[PDB]
Design a protein around this ligand. Structure first.
Ligand code: ATP
Ligand code: 5Y0
Ligand code: MG
Length: 280
């Protein structure tokens, strides 16, 4: 097919695009094709059987086709690590962006809201995929002003192997109390992403981890400063963060919210905003 059998020898490392919990990501040249990719190495110590079922489950990403979903090129195993080769987003994640910007303005975050809502509507409706880890380091951006999701849970096995070797500060209250994952949880992590990027920091009083986890279950959700953000943005984020998942807005409902309709209509030169702030 398009790329054939992908192997470690074909790739030359260009730079390192960063690291997180359990994996490193490099910008690479797939030399035979001339493709520039992002290569992400994942160390899992797993019985061969279980690894191959991951790499096969990962092939469902070849069928993922959305302007709001990072593109997939392949997935192989070499030397204890699974490689997931993907489209290289040249603006990095909103995480790295927020470090540089300090705060991301509301108007830009309305473009992210739209891209995030549409990305997730795509997964749910086309592929019956829930994201499972919406947060700003898994929302990625490029010099073409594009905004895309990665790191969603296509693979059941990888979900399982990941849960037992996460980002608990980003899980909704009900998920924290041990409930099975739902779309309404993608939405909380959306809400929470939008408030963190807006205010410039993880939007909870500082505390020890186990305290934070009960804090989230027990205490009322975060909110925007009312002074410096439109009422429609405050509503939008509030509806994403209702603690009862039954009463939280769903994606249908968010897509026609005052703040989304307002932002859709706006003309934001997000690409130039970006290239300005990260020196691209
Ligand atoms: N396709 C890509 N293009 C450009 N940069 C990427 C891509 N995928 C990941 N990165 C960068 O690599 C980093 C590593 O992401 P990874 O999924 O390795 O961890 P994370 O999401 O940052 O954190 P965690 O592991 O704690 O969830 C990200 O911060 C992002 O900057
Ligand atoms: O990589 C993922 N999480 O990473 C967190 C970090 O601790 C390790 O990097 C991850 C988790 C579950 C799953 F099903 C995936 F497919 C993942 N990878 C993944 C998914 C879609 C694209 I387009 C590109 C990708 F790479
Ligand atoms: Mg990531």
């Amino acid at each position: 097919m398009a790329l054939g059998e992908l192997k470690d020898d074909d790739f030359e490392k260009i730079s390192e695009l960063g690291a997180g919990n359990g994996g490193v990501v490099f910008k690479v040249s797939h030399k035979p094709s001339g493709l520039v990719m992002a290569r992400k190495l994942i160390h899992l110590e797993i019985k061969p059987a279980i690894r191959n079922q991951i790499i096969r489950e990962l092939q469902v990403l070849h069928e993922c086709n959305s302007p709001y979903i990072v593109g997939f090129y392949g997935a192989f195993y070499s030397d204890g690590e699974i490689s997931i080769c993907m489209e290289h987003m040249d603006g990095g994640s909103l995480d790295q962006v927020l470090k540089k910007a300090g705060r991301i303005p509301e108007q830009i975050l309305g473009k992210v809201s739209i891209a995030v809502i549409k990305g997730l509507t795509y997964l749910r409706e086309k592929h019956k995929i829930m994201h499972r880890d919406v947060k700003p380091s898994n929302i990625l951006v490029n010099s073409r002003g594009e905004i895309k999701l990665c790191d969603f849970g296509v693979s059941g096995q990888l979900i399982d192997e990941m849960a037992n070797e996460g980002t608990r500060s980003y899980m909704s209250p009900e998920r924290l109390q041990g409930t099975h994952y739902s779309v309404q949880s993608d939405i909380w992590s959306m809400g929470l992403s939008l408030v963190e990027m807006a205010v410039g920091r993880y939007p909870r009083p500082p505390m020890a981890i186990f305290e934070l986890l009960d804090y989230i279950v027990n205490e009322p959700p975060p909110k925007l400063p009312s002074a410096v953000f439109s009422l429609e943005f405050q509503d939008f984020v509030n509806k994403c963060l209702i603690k009862n998942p039954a009463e939280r807005a769903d994606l249908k409902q968010l897509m026609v919210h005052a703040f989304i309709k307002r932002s859709d209509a706006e003309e934001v030169d997000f690409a130039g905003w970006l290239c300005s702030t990260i020196g691209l």
